[PDB]
Design an enzyme around this catalytic site. Structure first.
Site, PDB file in Angstrom:
ATOM      1  N   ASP A  38      39.923  33.937  44.755  1.00 37.27           N
ATOM      2  CA  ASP A  38      39.192  34.738  43.766  1.00 37.27           C
ATOM      3  C   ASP A  38      39.808  34.627  42.353  1.00 37.27           C
ATOM      4  OD1 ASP A  38      37.621  36.670  42.515  1.00 37.27           O
ATOM      5  OD2 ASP A  38      39.007  38.306  42.987  1.00 37.27           O
ATOM      6  N   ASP A 226      34.230  32.987  37.925  1.00 40.04           N
ATOM      7  CA  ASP A 226      34.745  33.814  38.999  1.00 40.04           C
ATOM      8  C   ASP A 226      34.389  33.232  40.364  1.00 40.04           C
ATOM      9  OD1 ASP A 226      35.511  35.766  40.734  1.00 40.04           O
ATOM     10  OD2 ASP A 226      34.346  37.412  39.879  1.00 40.04           O
TER      11      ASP A 226
HETATM   12  C1  LIG Z   1      36.573  41.069  35.956  1.00 40.44           C
HETATM   13  C2  LIG Z   1      35.745  40.834  37.250  1.00 40.44           C
HETATM   14  C3  LIG Z   1      36.682  40.808  38.476  1.00 40.44           C
HETATM   15  C4  LIG Z   1      35.843  40.499  39.731  1.00 40.44           C
HETATM   16  C5  LIG Z   1      36.677  40.449  41.032  1.00 40.44           C
HETATM   17  O1  LIG Z   1      37.777  39.502  40.942  1.00 40.44           O
HETATM   18  C6  LIG Z   1      35.740  40.089  42.199  1.00 40.44           C
HETATM   19  N1  LIG Z   1      35.331  38.680  41.998  1.00 40.44           N
HETATM   20  C7  LIG Z   1      36.375  40.237  43.594  1.00 40.44           C
HETATM   21  N2  LIG Z   1      35.336  40.199  44.662  1.00 40.44           N
HETATM   22  C8  LIG Z   1      34.541  41.433  44.658  1.00 40.44           C
HETATM   23  C9  LIG Z   1      33.518  41.460  45.766  1.00 40.44           C
HETATM   24  O2  LIG Z   1      32.617  42.255  45.677  1.00 40.44           O
HETATM   25  N3  LIG Z   1      33.576  40.655  46.850  1.00 40.44           N
HETATM   26  C10 LIG Z   1      32.594  40.707  47.840  1.00 40.44           C
HETATM   27  C11 LIG Z   1      31.604  39.744  47.803  1.00 40.44           C
HETATM   28  C12 LIG Z   1      30.655  39.736  48.801  1.00 40.44           C
HETATM   29  C13 LIG Z   1      30.640  40.689  49.809  1.00 40.44           C
HETATM   30  C14 LIG Z   1      31.628  41.670  49.841  1.00 40.44           C
HETATM   31  C15 LIG Z   1      32.588  41.635  48.855  1.00 40.44           C
HETATM   32 CL1  LIG Z   1      33.752  42.858  48.910  1.00 40.44          CL
HETATM   33  C16 LIG Z   1      34.638  39.653  47.032  1.00 40.44           C
HETATM   34  C17 LIG Z   1      35.828  39.902  46.073  1.00 40.44           C
HETATM   35  C18 LIG Z   1      36.665  38.615  46.126  1.00 40.44           C
HETATM   36  C19 LIG Z   1      36.677  41.064  46.647  1.00 40.44           C
HETATM   37  C20 LIG Z   1      37.485  42.098  38.529  1.00 40.44           C
HETATM   38  O3  LIG Z   1      36.892  43.133  38.678  1.00 40.44           O
HETATM   39  N4  LIG Z   1      38.831  42.115  38.390  1.00 40.44           N
HETATM   40  C21 LIG Z   1      39.617  43.355  38.431  1.00 40.44           C
HETATM   41  C22 LIG Z   1      41.030  43.023  38.930  1.00 40.44           C
HETATM   42  C23 LIG Z   1      41.769  41.973  38.014  1.00 40.44           C
HETATM   43  C24 LIG Z   1      41.900  42.492  36.569  1.00 40.44           C
HETATM   44  C25 LIG Z   1      40.454  42.744  36.100  1.00 40.44           C
HETATM   45  C26 LIG Z   1      39.749  43.834  36.989  1.00 40.44           C
HETATM   46  C27 LIG Z   1      40.550  45.133  36.938  1.00 40.44           C
HETATM   47  C28 LIG Z   1      41.962  44.877  37.495  1.00 40.44           C
HETATM   48  O4  LIG Z   1      42.590  46.167  37.537  1.00 40.44           O
HETATM   49  C29 LIG Z   1      42.685  43.836  36.596  1.00 40.44           C
HETATM   50  C30 LIG Z   1      41.871  44.304  38.933  1.00 40.44           C
END
Ligand SMILES: CC[C@H](C[C@H](O)[C@@H](N)CN1CC(=O)N(c2ccccc2Cl)CC1(C)C)C(=O)N[C@@H]1[C@@H]2C[C@@H]3C[C@H]1C[C@@](O)(C3)C2
Ligand SMILES: *[C@@H]1O[C@H](CO)[C@@H](O)[C@H](O)[C@H]1NC(C)=O
Length: 340
Positions: A38, A226
């Site tokens: 990710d 992403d």
């Molecule tokens: C800035 C965007 C970034 C996006 C995020 O890395 C998503 N691409 C992750 N996905 C969400 C999701 O929903 N998924 C998912 C997909 C399909 C079905 C079910 C699931 Cl759970 C898969 C994952 C890999 C967990 C973020 O929020 N980053 C956050 C992180 C890093 C940084 C910026 C944001 C706030 C922080 O505190 C600091 C933590």
């Protein structure tokens, strides 16, 4: 920064065009976990055996159990990861982690609080954060940084290939190359775009064009790249307007069109660096039928990403599927090439 002569690959499985995940082992002996690599985040975590079984998402995933690992080293600091689409929480541990045949001592979150939505809808168990340390919660070195330290990889880069989902098992779902790219999976030349700033996998976007009338991001905007996002996404207000131009109906979580209208939909183009990146409707419509009596969902979604990273578009699986993607930490840029 020391470079070696090695490249490693991680074979990915493709669940429904929406989740691309590979296998890692944690601990001695290894406990295996399905994880998403990710670039939107920088922490590693997997569900912990200390997760209360009242989280059903924990009942339905692999749980790391420290008591069975002889190389585990306790730490215990609270950790919360608050992604735009959901949150997880737990505490930090360290153990040895195997990824693509590389063994690395890594500090990672054991998650004890895992919401049923979204996690019940995850085929994967955990996440391997591929972003910069600037964005790591708890200041934990990300796994790629720790591997770079061993001085074995030929380049300070990694690359994603995401396949189009096949029914036939001898199609690989996709491939990550650590320390390189794989010329079997792209053609023509890479074109690069510089990161706005080191610390985040985000580049400037000069315009978004739909067909030959509509113009979005007219004055410029951000594009987060992403690998852990299913979709291409825009701010609610941008997508409101893109979807107007396509004749699409808004639902709670997605947009749809009558399935017969799908192949009539215009191209969508993203202006990144020197080049226009063009998707046709077959690239963004889940064309599950051609009937007027059925709805088809689109792989472009509305999503408001919080500051400081947002407001921002995000180029996820819908985009990468067309465009083989290289992440260059040496020169802080991203390269795209036509996937094959
Ligand atoms: C800035 C965007 C970034 C996006 C995020 O890395 C998503 N691409 C992750 N996905 C969400 C999701 O929903 N998924 C998912 C997909 C399909 C079905 C079910 C699931 Cl759970 C898969 C994952 C890999 C967990 C973020 O929020 N980053 C956050 C992180 C890093 C940084 C910026 C944001 C706030 C922080 O505190 C600091 C933590
Ligand atoms: C967890 O790791 C940090 C990183 O240096 C350290 O300072 C802290 O003391 C650790 N806590 C425990 C209880 O091991």
């Amino acid at each position: 920064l020391t470079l070696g002569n090695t490249t490693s690959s991680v074979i990915l499985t493709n669940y429904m065009d929406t989740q691309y995940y590979g296998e890692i082992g944690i601990g001695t002996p290894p406990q295996t976990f399905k994880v998403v690599f990710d670039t939107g985040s920088s922490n590693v975590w997997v569900p912990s055996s200390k997760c209360s079984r009242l989280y059903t998402a924990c009942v339905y995933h692999k749980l790391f159990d420290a008591s069975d690992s002889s190389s585990y080293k306790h730490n215990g600091t609270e950790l919360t990861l608050r992604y735009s689409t959901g949150t997880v929480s737990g505490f930090l541990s360290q153990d040895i982690i195997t990824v693509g045949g590389i063994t690395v001592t890594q500090m990672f979150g054991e998650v004890t609080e895992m919401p049923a939505l979204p996690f019940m809808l995850a085929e994967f168990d955990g996440v391997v954060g591929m972003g910069f340390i600037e964005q790591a919660i708890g200041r934990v070195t990300p796994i790629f940084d720790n591997i770079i330290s061993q001085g074995v990889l030929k380049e300070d880069v990694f690359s994603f290939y995401y396949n189009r989902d096949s029914e036939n098992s001898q199609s690989l779902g996709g491939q990550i190359v650590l320390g390189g790219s794989d010329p079997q999976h792209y053609e023509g030349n890479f074109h690069y775009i510089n990161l706005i700033k080191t610390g985040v996998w985000q580049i400037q976007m000069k315009g978004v064009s739909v067909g030959s009338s509509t113009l979005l991001c007219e004055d410029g905007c951000l594009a987060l790249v992403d690998t852990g996002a299913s979709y291409i996404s825009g701010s609610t207000s941008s997508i409101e307007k893109l979807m107007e131009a396509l004749g699409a109906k808004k639902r709670l979580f997605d947009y749809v069109v009558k399935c017969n209208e799908g192949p009539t939909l215009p191209d969508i183009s993203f202006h990144l660096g020197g080049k226009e990146y063009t998707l046709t409707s077959a690239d963004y419509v889940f064309q599950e039928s051609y009937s007027s009596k059925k709805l088809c969902t689109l792989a472009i979604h509305a999503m408001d990403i919080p500051p400081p990273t947002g407001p921002t578009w995000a180029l996820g699986a819908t985009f990468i599927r067309k465009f083989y993607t290289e992440f260059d930490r040496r020169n802080n840029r991203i390269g795209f090439a036509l996937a094959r």
